[PDB]
Coordinates of C-alpha atoms and ligand atoms in Angstrom, one line a residue:
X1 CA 100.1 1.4 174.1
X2 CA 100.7 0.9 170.5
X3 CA 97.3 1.9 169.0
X4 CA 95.9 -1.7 168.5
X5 CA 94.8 -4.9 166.8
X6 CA 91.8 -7.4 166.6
X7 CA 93.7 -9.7 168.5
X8 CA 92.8 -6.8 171.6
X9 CA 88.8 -6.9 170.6
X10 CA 89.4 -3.5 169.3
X11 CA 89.0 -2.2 165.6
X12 CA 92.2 -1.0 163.7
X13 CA 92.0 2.0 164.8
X14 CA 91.0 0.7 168.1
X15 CA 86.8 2.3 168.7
X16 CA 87.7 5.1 171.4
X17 CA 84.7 4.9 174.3
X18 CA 82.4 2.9 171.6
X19 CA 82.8 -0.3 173.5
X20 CA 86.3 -0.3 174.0
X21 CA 87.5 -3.5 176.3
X22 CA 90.8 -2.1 177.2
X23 CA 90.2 0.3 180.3
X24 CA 88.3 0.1 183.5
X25 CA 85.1 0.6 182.6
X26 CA 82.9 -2.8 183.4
Ligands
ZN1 ZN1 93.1 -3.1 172.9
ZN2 ZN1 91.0 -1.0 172.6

């Protein structure tokens, strides 16, 4: 959890859908 960082390849805040490489969706 914990919203996110760019150490995650996510934006601060993290995108939400927009490319997002933290769920199953690949
Ligand atoms: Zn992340
Ligand atoms: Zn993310």
């Amino acid at each position: 959890g914990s919203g996110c960082d760019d150490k995650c390849g996510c934006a601060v805040p993290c995108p939400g859908g927009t490319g997002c490489r933290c769920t199953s969706a690949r």
